[PDB]
Amino acid sequence: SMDDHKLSLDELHRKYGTDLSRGLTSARAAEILARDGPNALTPPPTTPEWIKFCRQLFGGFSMLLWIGAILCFLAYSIQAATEEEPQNDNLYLGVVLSAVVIITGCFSYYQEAKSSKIMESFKNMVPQQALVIRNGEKMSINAEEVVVGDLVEVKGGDRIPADLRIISANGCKVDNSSLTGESEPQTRSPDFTNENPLETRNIAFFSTNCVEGTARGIVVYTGDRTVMGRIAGQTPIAAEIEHFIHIITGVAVFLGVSFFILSLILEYTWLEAVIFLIGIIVANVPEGLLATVTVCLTLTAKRMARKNCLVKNLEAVETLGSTSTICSDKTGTLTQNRMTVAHMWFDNQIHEADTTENQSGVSFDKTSATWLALSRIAGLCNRAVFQANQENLPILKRAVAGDASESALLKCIELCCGSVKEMRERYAKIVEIPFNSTNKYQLSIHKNPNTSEPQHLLVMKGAPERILDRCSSILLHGKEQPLDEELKDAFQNAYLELGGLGERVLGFCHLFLPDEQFPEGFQFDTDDVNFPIDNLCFVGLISMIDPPRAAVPDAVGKCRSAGIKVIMVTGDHPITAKAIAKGVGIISEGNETVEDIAARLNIPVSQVNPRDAKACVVHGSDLKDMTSEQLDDILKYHTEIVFARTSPQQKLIIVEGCQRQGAIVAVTGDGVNDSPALKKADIGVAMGIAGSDVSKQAADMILLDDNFASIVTGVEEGRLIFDNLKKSIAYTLTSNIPEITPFLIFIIANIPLPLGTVTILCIDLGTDMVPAISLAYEQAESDIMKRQPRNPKTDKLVNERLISMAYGQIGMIQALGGFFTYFVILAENGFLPIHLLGLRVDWDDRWINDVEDSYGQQWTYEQRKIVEFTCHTAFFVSIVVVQWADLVICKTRRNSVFQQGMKNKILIFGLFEETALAAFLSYCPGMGVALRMYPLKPTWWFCAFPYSLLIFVYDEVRKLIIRRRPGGWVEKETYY
Amino acid sequence: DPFYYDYETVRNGGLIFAGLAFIVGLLILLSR
Amino acid sequence: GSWKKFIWNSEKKEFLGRTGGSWFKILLFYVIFYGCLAGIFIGTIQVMLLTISEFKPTYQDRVAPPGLTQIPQIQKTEISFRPNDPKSYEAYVLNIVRFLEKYKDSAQRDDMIFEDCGDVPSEPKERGDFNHERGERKVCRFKLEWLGNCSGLNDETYGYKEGKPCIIIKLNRVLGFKPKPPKNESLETYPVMKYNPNVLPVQCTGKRDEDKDKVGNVEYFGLGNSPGFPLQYYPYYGKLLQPKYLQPLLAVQFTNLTMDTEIRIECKAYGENIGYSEKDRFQGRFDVKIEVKS
Ligand SMILES: CCCCCCCCCCCCCCCCCC(=O)OC[C@H](COP(=O)([O-])OCC[N+](C)(C)C)OC(=O)CCCCCCCCCCCCCCCCC
Ligand SMILES: CC(C)CCC[C@H](C)[C@H]1CC[C@H]2[C@H]3CC=C4C[C@@H](OC(=O)CCC(=O)O)CC[C@@]4(C)[C@@H]3CC[C@@]12C
Ligand SMILES: CC(C)CCC[C@H](C)[C@H]1CC[C@H]2[C@H]3CC=C4C[C@@H](OC(=O)CCC(=O)O)CC[C@@]4(C)[C@@H]3CC[C@@]12C
Ligand SMILES: CC(C)CCC[C@H](C)[C@H]1CC[C@H]2[C@H]3CC=C4C[C@@H](OC(=O)CCC(=O)O)CC[C@@]4(C)[C@@H]3CC[C@@]12C
Ligand SMILES: CC(C)CCC[C@H](C)[C@H]1CC[C@H]2[C@H]3CC=C4C[C@@H](OC(=O)CCC(=O)O)CC[C@@]4(C)[C@@H]3CC[C@@]12C
Ligand SMILES: CC(C)CCC[C@H](C)[C@H]1CC[C@H]2[C@H]3CC=C4C[C@@H](OC(=O)CCC(=O)O)CC[C@@]4(C)[C@@H]3CC[C@@]12C
Ligand SMILES: CC(C)CCC[C@H](C)[C@H]1CC[C@H]2[C@H]3CC=C4C[C@@H](OC(=O)CCC(=O)O)CC[C@@]4(C)[C@@H]3CC[C@@]12C
Ligand SMILES: *[C@@H]1O[C@H](CO)[C@@H](O[C@@H]2O[C@H](CO)[C@@H](O)[C@H](O)[C@H]2NC(C)=O)[C@H](O)[C@H]1NC(C)=O
Ligand SMILES: *[C@@H]1O[C@H](CO)[C@@H](O)[C@H](O)[C@H]1NC(C)=O
Ligand SMILES: [Mg+2]
Ligand code: NA
Ligand code: NA
Ligand code: NA
Ligand code: NA
């Protein structure tokens, strides 16, 4: 429909609730909140909470265990009609195969719903903020409640929160890429230019940003009724677990089909063969890994939010842990960006600031016209103003509306030389200049209040090396002593002795223009430059100290021990950047640049071999003319690189240069010029308290505390998930040999069967469901930040060393621990072990009711099948007993369990749930006819204690050899 | 009698152990 | 894995991605590893065999009331034959002849092993104790002539040639077991037969109600005149102490079977020790289906 862009501001009075200034109103706010819908775009409804349940109950690899129950109930339904004495045995088989599906589907749905509930809790974690100008006095609000008739003020880098009509802008430029497809900013103005209401300048749009400038606009639509409100993934660590599950599925399907047609030769009663096939396929395929990976990801994301490191998608979790390069900025991230004045220099003497109450009187609060003029220059250039409720607050804290340097400068002026706003109205600012990035020239021409001098003053401040050509004549005692060469040498010495401790310096110069250029009447403008700028009245230098953050100098050491390379990209002088890098530990001691060894041996810099210097400080002006080959070996031959005097716009040329060597680069940005460099890096980090919305729509992280050390803690939490996934995969695969081998030795050796299909499903449901997911909650070992970064090209999760440990070494001990208990039971009832070789044909014969044992007595058919089902029960129980030691050794990878501790509460619950399920399935009245499971003697629970102890002893001695001998044969062959 | 072996005592002990090992796991899990 | 490039290099000599001095170590590791695993398994088995006696099993409660079986070893508890067809009943006669080899009178002549227990039923004979202090124990000898009209001293087809077939019933051996016949309250067991205090009684009747009208007459042959197992034997001492032990037998003949009908017959044994089951249809009891085609 037609939007109110054609009608001007008078009809904007006469279209909304009478407000174009001073805010709208409280009452009106509630009324237009109740009239229209709030600013939330309404979500599409997803599938309800029973379709997600039937996709897990009747899903993949559970239809097999449903059709097994259907066939069992069909065989019982056939038998109950055309047979007398119907003998309901397939009824309980169908009941058991139906109960296994319900339990496994309920566990899978619970583990899916918990991770969905956690990952849904990151929206409204860092909501949106809109700047309105309500009756109050300019406030930020939750942005999902604004109304039609508000006036909002946006600036460079903010998000437009509603449908806007612009009233007063200073060249804001919206990027029209969400509804047109243009990658070019467009100028906005309150006029009426285009006939089409969409490609015009009258209005602004939802889900857009007006980069530069500011704007004051009025809301026309909110919520669903905007032009955006109408109209309308995998993980590289999940797409590998899928590919592994497909290969294990093919192997298990081959094994189950091969075991299916091998049983029918042994007269195995077609229902039993089908149930045996289904039980092999279901139990030998690790379907519960695909849940575990999600629980490994989402939980980790939650912990990253508890340490001020917020992710934007789950694909950014597994790539943050493989980070090999961090290219961070200096101001705001490494340092606090709360600077105070220290160590001014004027009249060939470094002074002290004397910030505190201990007034050393350092030639201050007195009469000496050089520092009076210097403090007057540093007082009438500070654009920052103070807020209300501050003039009765001490020096120790002050709210102030401005950037860092001028807020630092206002401290010394409001401390030393009275109030400040009286000094602003004394010398009237007649033309201002905003702070430019090209020459860094802050100027504000002033005039006398009534009279102070016949030559009224013009001011100049900025970088001292960028004003050394402009202002040269010093102010010793009011005297403009001209350019002097040893004085420039002393200025250079002051520059090195003020940048050498790590301070940003600012120069100060001024002018006494006569009345020849402006009289007392009409003044002169500064946009048309008719002022002499060369050989001006320099007064002195002011520097400011900037403390680095709290937990940074050991976070850089943890980045160094973990093989991550840190790059510092600042916009400061290349001697202060070297000082800050040596202060925080970027350039550690022992490492030096070519300037240091050149000034060491007193050979000039230009002929030093650039191979003995591993640290390097690159000026930003040389970055523009160097081609790709010089950058691609600056980043190759050095180890500690610091880019100084560098614009953020050329950050991108760094990042690709680090990506060609092969690296996962993490880049911090907070501006609108960094957004080409954020989404070219492998992981982009936005800032949380500073940083506009364009900077955080392009990044994969949010730093909620603006600290560098939170990135390092995020690298820890990202590194943890590969360890936890390898531990869970290693635990899950060990229970495959004791489920395969009892049927193999049944065929080969012709002994009675040690394990049936019901106890195979019991083994799988008991020892694979709960304790395999408890290794996702495992704490971090002591050597996660002492290993190198993993390469996601040559380092997969599964190796030939992970398969040959689970299938070849640990699984065989569990198979032997089961077979021992089988032989112990069958030898204590009368069948000695040599007598069992060859007994299978007579044992399984229903019409041979006198089978002789080693003592000579004669067994019935049911009397020996009861002993066989007791052997099945204790096979399952001994598998649970060795599962214990399999779960205990599979929670560490190179540390011992005595230096890891039992801090995992889910693992102890897994052990107790295992043992409670085993002791309940054996000793409950009623399991003898349903499950065919019979009670064990109390001394049969200790038959697989030595094999469970052997697993523990073997794995502890193996890990000890790996720790005390790195790079040996045991680490090369067994360390998975 | 070498032919009897009452199973009720070991069944009572096993069910007591199952109830104990279930409630202690419940108290370890819900300890948070 | 790719193809040739991975099957062999000969610029590093790496068959399957592993050099030949590395294939030797990874196989020596698995040979030593499985050798020590086999050693530990054999050692635990040999240690467990030291707690096992060689005269008495550790647990006897899973054979505790014995089964009751019949000697023509048949395939679905079914006997079916034609008397004027000497190829239908030949397997049954061959089974009975192969079973009654060791019961012959010429196979019991060794008087230092076999002994002459009485020809009337008597009390159990304790041979001592399970302690090997007397060596091998002697065994009572069973004469075939007590199975008369069912032994091989006559009709050598055991009745199958002339209509009326005959089975041989025996109770399963349990080491150390002494059967207790029921008491004599004259109300206790069912229904009525001749009672003897040293005979475990057996009775074979028809199963359904139409089978009781068709089974006809049933003859028993054993030691004495009360049908059942004598008690002079028992309790089996085991095949270490008593090789060539001979369990007592009981022959049952069906002299007046009804022709061309399938008849179900249940044989039960009575006593205090003897108990029955509902799933085990061979414990203390059995059943047979006979069908004499004409
Ligand atoms: C009741 C509890 C008892 C528990 C007992 C459990 C025993 C624990 C055994 C587990 C250890 C597993 C590795 C053992 C092999 C150690 C090899 C070694 O030391 O490397 C030397 C060294 C390590 O030092 P290196 O290799 O790095 O030397 C470096 C050389 N320079 C410096 C020049 C580079 O490796 C070798 O060079 C040669 C090793 C060849 C290995 C050949 C295979 C040996 C066969 C081992 C059989 C052990 C099986 C026993 C398991 C039985 C348990 C069921
Ligand atoms: C009697 C037969 C037919 C089954 C009857 C239904 C099942 C008892 C249902 C009820 C709730 C289901 C499950 C839903 C919750 C899980 C949480 C699980 O605990 C954990 O996962 C560890 C703690 C944690 O994950 O934080 C243990 C019980 C279990 C498997 C439940 C087991 C029983 C399920 C399959
Ligand atoms: C490890 C898994 C995959 C297989 C382990 C079981 C074995 C495959 C089978 C083969 C024959 C079995 C047993 C049959 C014979 C006995 C006799 C036993 O004692 C003796 O050897 C004494 C012999 C004598 O004195 O006459 C030692 C070996 C043992 C336990 C064998 C051990 C190996 C068994 C269980
Ligand atoms: C079936 C059994 C025989 C094998 C599986 C059980 C383990 C072999 C045993 C060996 C000793 C037991 C535990 C006894 C108590 C210690 C305390 C623990 O030490 C600490 O608590 C240190 C805490 C910290 O440093 O943070 C080291 C492991 C642990 C749990 C042991 C882990 C392994 C246990 C369960
Ligand atoms: C049947 C019984 C008599 C066999 C004896 C069992 C052994 C005493 C087991 C118990 C646990 C095993 C080991 C597993 C735990 C480690 C912790 C380890 O202590 C450390 O922290 C090592 C630190 C380092 O080396 O840097 C030294 C002892 C050791 C090898 C243990 C030594 C004793 C082992 C071989
Ligand atoms: C990994 C380390 C810390 C061992 C942890 C394993 C289990 C959590 C704990 C629970 C109590 C322990 C056992 C203490 C003794 C009982 C005897 C048994 O019950 C009987 O004695 C037979 C029945 C009866 O006595 O009547 C049930 C299992 C068992 C082995 C327990 C199960 C497993 C243990 C080692
Ligand atoms: C990981 C594997 C190697 C462990 C399997 C257990 C044992 C380590 C292996 C070694 C060889 C296997 C068996 C191969 C076949 C022989 C037959 C047997 O010889 C006989 O006397 C049987 C013939 C007869 O006398 O009636 C002696 C032991 C036995 C079971 C071996 C017992 C031990 C086995 C199971
Ligand atoms: C055992 O078999 C013999 C013959 O083999 C039976 O003896 C005959 O029985 C019939 C039955 O009426 C008599 O008429 C004959 O006179 C008997 N002959 C002889 C020589 O005795 C004998 O009855 C059978 N024993 C039984 C059935 O208990
Ligand atoms: C078999 O013969 C006996 C003769 O004593 C007779 O009583 C019985 O009814 C007969 N049975 C049949 C089935 O003919
Ligand atoms: Mg930044
Ligand atoms: Na599974
Ligand atoms: Na991005
Ligand atoms: Na397992
Ligand atoms: Na498994």
Residue numbers in the entry:
A (entry chain A): 40 to 271, 280 to 1023
B (entry chain C): 17 to 48
C (entry chain B): 10 to 303
Source paper text:
The sodium potassium pump (Na+/K+-ATPase, NKA) is expressed in the plasma membrane of all animal cells and belongs to the P2-type ATPase family. NKA converts energy derived from ATP hydrolysis into an electrochemical potential gradient of Na+ and K+ across the plasma membrane, which is required for numerous physiological processes. NKA undergoes an ATP-driven transport cycle called the Post-Albers scheme, during which NKA exchanges three cytoplasmic Na+ for two extracellular K+ through transition between the E1 and E2 states coupled with hydrolysis of one ATP molecule. NKA consists of a large multi-transmembrane catalytic α subunit, a single transmembrane β subunit, and an auxiliary γ subunit called FXYD.
To trap hNKA in the E1 state, only Na+ and Mg2+ were added to the buffer during purification. We successfully solved the cryo-EM structures of hNKA in the E1·3Na and E1·3Na·ATP states preceding ATP hydrolyzed at 3.2 Å and 2.9 Å resolution in the absence or presence of a slowly hydrolyzed ATP analogue (ATPγS), respectively, which represent two E1 states of NKA preceding ATP hydrolysis previously unknown according to our knowledge. The E1·3Na and E1·3Na·ATP structures present two snapshots of the open conformation of the cytosolic headpiece without direct interaction between the A and N domains, which are significantly different from the E1~P·[3Na]·ADP state. The structures of the E1·3Na and E1·3Na·ATP states are very similar to each other, with a root mean square deviation (RMSD) of 1.388 Å of 976 Cα atoms from α subunit, except for a slight difference in the Na+ binding sites at the transmembrane region and in the ATP binding pocket at the cytoplasmic headpiece of the α1 subunit. In the E1·3Na and E1·3Na·ATP structures, NKA has three Na+ binding sites, namely, I, II and III, which are surrounded by M4, M5, M6 and M8. Comparison between the E1·3Na and E1·3Na·ATP states shows that the binding of ATP causes a subtle shift of Na+ at site I, which are coordinated with Ala330, Ser782, Asn783, Thr779 and Asp815 in the E1·3Na state and that are coordinated with Ala330, Ser782, Asn783, Glu786, Asp811 and a water molecule in the E1·3Na·ATP state. The Thr781, Thr814 and Gln930 residues are involved in Na+ coordination at site III in the E1·3Na state, whereas the Asp933 residue is close to and coordinated with Na+ in the E1·3Na·ATP state. The densities of Na+ and the side chain of the gating residue Glu334 were not well resolved at site II in either E1·3Na or E1·3Na·ATP, while the density of other residues around the entrance of the cytoplasmic cavity was well resolved. The calculation results revealed that E1·3Na·ATP and E1·3Na in this work belong to the E1 state and are quite distinct from the E1~P·[3Na]·ADP state.
